[PDB]
Design an enzyme around this catalytic site. Structure first.
Site, short mmCIF file in Angstrom:
data_model
loop_
_atom_site.label_atom_id
_atom_site.label_comp_id
_atom_site.label_asym_id
_atom_site.label_seq_id
_atom_site.Cartn_x
_atom_site.Cartn_y
_atom_site.Cartn_z
N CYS A 57 1.33 -1.29 0.22
CA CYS A 57 -0.53 0.29 0.25
C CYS A 57 0.62 1.09 0.17
O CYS A 57 1.26 1.78 1.21
CB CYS A 57 -1.47 0.20 1.47
SG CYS A 57 -2.66 1.07 0.98
N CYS B 25 -2.19 4.09 -2.38
CA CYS B 25 -3.43 3.32 -2.85
C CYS B 25 -4.48 5.13 -1.60
O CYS B 25 -4.93 4.03 -1.81
CB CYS B 25 -2.71 2.32 -1.35
SG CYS B 25 -2.28 2.26 -0.18
#
Length: 128
Positions: free
Chosen positions: A53, A56
């Site tokens: 992530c 993101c």
């Protein structure tokens, strides 16, 4: 008192989110089902949320943006298979995140990385 006044809804954001997630969560067994569950010309974006992530943070609400705007011809899913990394190698995940497209069960393009411009481009490009 209350700042309630707005006409329609366009591309307006603030890196906010709010209740109303469109990113459909699906399990292994639901994948093919949900991909085929499409009516007609329904562009299905399958997000591969890798636990790394990176960008993101922005892309998630940005995807919801395009999801809510295009929801008439678009449905986004997110696969729950966090245990099996092979899925990444199989579907060709090489960035964070990675978006695959499918339509009517037919194979559709893949945008790897976090480029919302390319994402929206392909969304409209694949709807029309």
């Amino acid at each position: 008192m209350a700042h309630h006044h707005h006409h329609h809804m366009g591309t307006l954001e603030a890196q906010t989110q709010g209740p109303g997630s469109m990113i459909e969560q699906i399990g292994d067994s639901e994948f093919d089902n949900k991909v085929t569950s499409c009516n007609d010309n329904i562009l299905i974006l399958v997000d591969f949320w890798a636990p790394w992530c990176g960008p993101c943070r922005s892309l998630e609400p940005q995807l919801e943006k395009l999801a809510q705007q295009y929801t008439e011809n678009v449905k986004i899913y997110k696969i729950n298979i966090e245990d099996n990394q092979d899925v990444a190698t199989q579907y060709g995940v090489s960035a964070i995140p990675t978006i695959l497209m499918f339509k009517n069960g037919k194979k559709l393009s893949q945008v790897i990385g976090a480029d919302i411009s390319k994402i929206i481009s392909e969304i409209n490009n694949n709807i029309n």
